[PDB]
Design a protein around this nucleic acid. Sequence first.
RNA 1: AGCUAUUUAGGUAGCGCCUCGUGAAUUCAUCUCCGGGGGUAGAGCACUGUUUCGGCAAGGGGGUCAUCCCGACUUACCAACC
RNA 2: GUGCCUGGCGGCCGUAGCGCGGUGGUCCCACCUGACCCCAUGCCGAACUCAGAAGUGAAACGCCGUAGCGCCGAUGGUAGUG
RNA 3: UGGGGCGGUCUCCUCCUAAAGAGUAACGGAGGAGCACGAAGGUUGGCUAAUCCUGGUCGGACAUCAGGAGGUUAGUGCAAUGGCAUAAGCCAGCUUGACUGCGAGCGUGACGGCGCGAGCAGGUGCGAAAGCAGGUCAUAGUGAUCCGGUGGUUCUGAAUGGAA
Lengths: 177, 41, 75, 116
Amino acid sequence: AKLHDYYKDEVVKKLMTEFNYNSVMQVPRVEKITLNMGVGEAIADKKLLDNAAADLAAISGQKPLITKARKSVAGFKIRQGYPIGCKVTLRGERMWEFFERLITIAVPRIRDFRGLSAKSFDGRGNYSMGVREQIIFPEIDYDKVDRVRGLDITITTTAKSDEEGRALLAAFDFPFR
Amino acid sequence: MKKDIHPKYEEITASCSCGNVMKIRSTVGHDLNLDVCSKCH
Amino acid sequence: RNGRDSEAKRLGVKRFGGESVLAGSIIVRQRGTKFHAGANVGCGRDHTLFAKADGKVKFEVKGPKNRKFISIEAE
Amino acid sequence: DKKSARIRRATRARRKLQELGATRLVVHRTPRHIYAQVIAPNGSEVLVAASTVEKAIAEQLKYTGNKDAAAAVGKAVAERALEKGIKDVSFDRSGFQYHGRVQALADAAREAGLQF
RNA sequence: AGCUAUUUAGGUAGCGCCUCGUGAAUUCAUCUCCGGGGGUAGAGCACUGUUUCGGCAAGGGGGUCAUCCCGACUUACCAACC
RNA sequence: GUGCCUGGCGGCCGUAGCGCGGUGGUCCCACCUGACCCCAUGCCGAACUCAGAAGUGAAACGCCGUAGCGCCGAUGGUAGUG
RNA sequence: UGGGGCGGUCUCCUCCUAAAGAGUAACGGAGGAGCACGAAGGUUGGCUAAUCCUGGUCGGACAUCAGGAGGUUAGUGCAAUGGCAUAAGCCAGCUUGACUGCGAGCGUGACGGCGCGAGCAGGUGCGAAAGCAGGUCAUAGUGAUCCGGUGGUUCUGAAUGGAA
């Protein structure tokens, strides 16, 4: 949680001079991160979810949340209330441990990477990016799983505009190209 | 932080090709050495 | 093919606003909850608002969502 | 919203008591200063009320907004209501779970004499 | 010359309607005033369906594609949801 | 003599509620700090909860204007009708 | 049975007709039922939608996630109408009140009969407690009498004690 402290010291004064936030609490405080994986193909392979559930527990320090079906749809052939989603949400100090794991051992391992695009901001200062692999995390043991399960990780904040949250990420030497 | 549902934490000390050793609690099993890091961006 | 009608349940209001009733007397035999139980007024499993006290019937519209209530003041 | 959710959570227990015409003991739990009021069956005028916002109670206490504060308050509202002359009362979760301070305040009233 | 039931439908039974006897409270009826819930007429189109039209134009079909597949220049033109 | 404030519980249920601009931190409220344990998550101190409380007034809520709306709404005429 | 042979109808529940209490006909117009659940029941506690806008491995109009708007257009075992966030909708724990003898007083029927019901006595369970629970959001899921089968109960048992 060293970047937790880094945020509370260098970043706070860094934005109070650029944007001139008259109040201390008036800062884009990052709330939570949610490593999601809409596996979805559990329609037959019930154990596909078991690997992905264990994979999230392996990468992130907690048991995931098995998500059911919010609605019945025949285009994908699912009925409402059935195991199809695999997600988690890091909140608090353990969210920083993953955030520390992000800029130092996760994002550096991004394949064919020369710049992170923050064009995936929802519109309310929250970034919901999605990468095609979990291999960027050394927690996966390469030959343990025969498939590099893609996923989507959302970084939730408290900002309003995209650039208020985009420059927020730049305060951690984030790739921008 | 519910009991017996969370895999244990272990202070993981992994390095980089430059020697960027970082100690943080994680659940891996081993400590490997990497190619790039934050200092190698 | 049609030509079938159930019956007539004889529903509706039984005793109207401002009438001396006794406890147990049915006030309104409804289906949904068109009216709502008030003070000294009980509701059955049939949503049948009946009297619990002995007095006069009083109709009103209370609550923030404006719902019809039936209460009986002690006389 | 913690405010509104707490309110609609206490509506059932609150409305059931007002259709009973029973004197109730409504309490308010906050991160600091726990309150307690005794509302009459008309629901308009209160009978007695004691809290830590009255310096006299918090001065003999260590902190305003914790377990021992609740029992001290529960003691105060029960000793006053008895000196006022009320016997049977009903409790009120007020959206808060009957677990800690709310429970702490509750048991203190029973041992004093408030029947519920 | 109604209601309810009926191998019942121009029969019959109970009740309503008539009559005679009897016993009872301003009991009952009209009008004024007050206390009541209704949703038809009318009005109206949030909702509920539907209305024709335009547009949206997504689903869909075909010259058109690499016309094995994703995909299509483009569009007859229907068009779920709209 | 009282007023300005906040908090709680009610009567009353849009003349009361929304949008918008500006405002409150001593208190109070909220957020927030920490969470061996009470308690808790079909994952997560988010909520529930406990111990407290540096800082802040952003969020939230309270207040004062604004009618850009919603809303209350006559009189008269008209539709309809006994 | 519109006079008749032919096809449908017959009991029960919802809506319209039905003229703003109730009721109200047609071989008038649309429809459904002849069950289901041990939990979908009881209780304490928590939660509350559809729907599109956007940003996201697979994933694209239509699976998963985040925020916003939105507001019950969702859901409610089943037909429809009425009702519901105090939720009756959704979830969890503990449980069996899906309890016994009653029952002021009303609803509705010609009657048979059907429906509601505070409270009383006994006992039970959930809840800290106030209280709540004598089936399920309500309204369909059903058929009388006779004859007869089973179990219980000295109430009776044609002389008496028994039994049938």
